[PDB]
Every structure is written in C-alpha cells, then in structure tokens.
C-alpha cells in the first residue's frame, strides 16, 4: 500500500495538490502530491 507512482493522468506539471489529488483518485491510487525530486504529481496507490 502507498506505492509511489507519478500520475499518468496528470497532463502537466505539478502546480497544485488539488488537481493532482483527483488525478490519483481517477487512477488506481489514493493520494497525490508533488514529488520532492522534480515537479510531477506523485500519486500513492494502495498496492
């Protein structure tokens, strides 16, 4: 659970958590945020 994978659904740069949030929800995840490496929506899935 909580596997780190960038949102493939997210069509851009991680500007804000709100858009990233729903991107992870639509996909097979639960949470999402900006990855502290670059600036992509890093979603977490209940793997």
From Swiss-Prot:
Disulfide links within the chain: 3-47, 14-34, 20-41, 24-43
Superkingdom, natural source: Eukaryota
Keyword annotations of the record: Antimicrobial, Cell wall, Disulfide bond, Fungicide, Plant defense, Secreted, Signal, Vacuole
UniProt tissue specificity: Flower. Found in petals, stamen and pistils, but not in sepals. In particular, accumulation in a configuration surrounding the inner reproductive whorls.
Location in or out of the cell: Secreted, Cell wall; Vacuole
Single biological process term from Gene Ontology: killing of cells of another organism
Keyword Disulfide bond tagged: yes
GO cellular component terms attached to this protein's record: extracellular region; vacuole
Keyword ATP-binding: no
Primary location: secreted
Protein role: Involved in floral organogenesis. May play a protective role in flowers by protecting the reproductive organs from potential pathogen attack.
Family the entry assigns: Belongs to the DEFL family.
Protein name as catalogued: Defensin-like protein
The species this protein was found in: Nicotiana tabacum (Common tobacco)
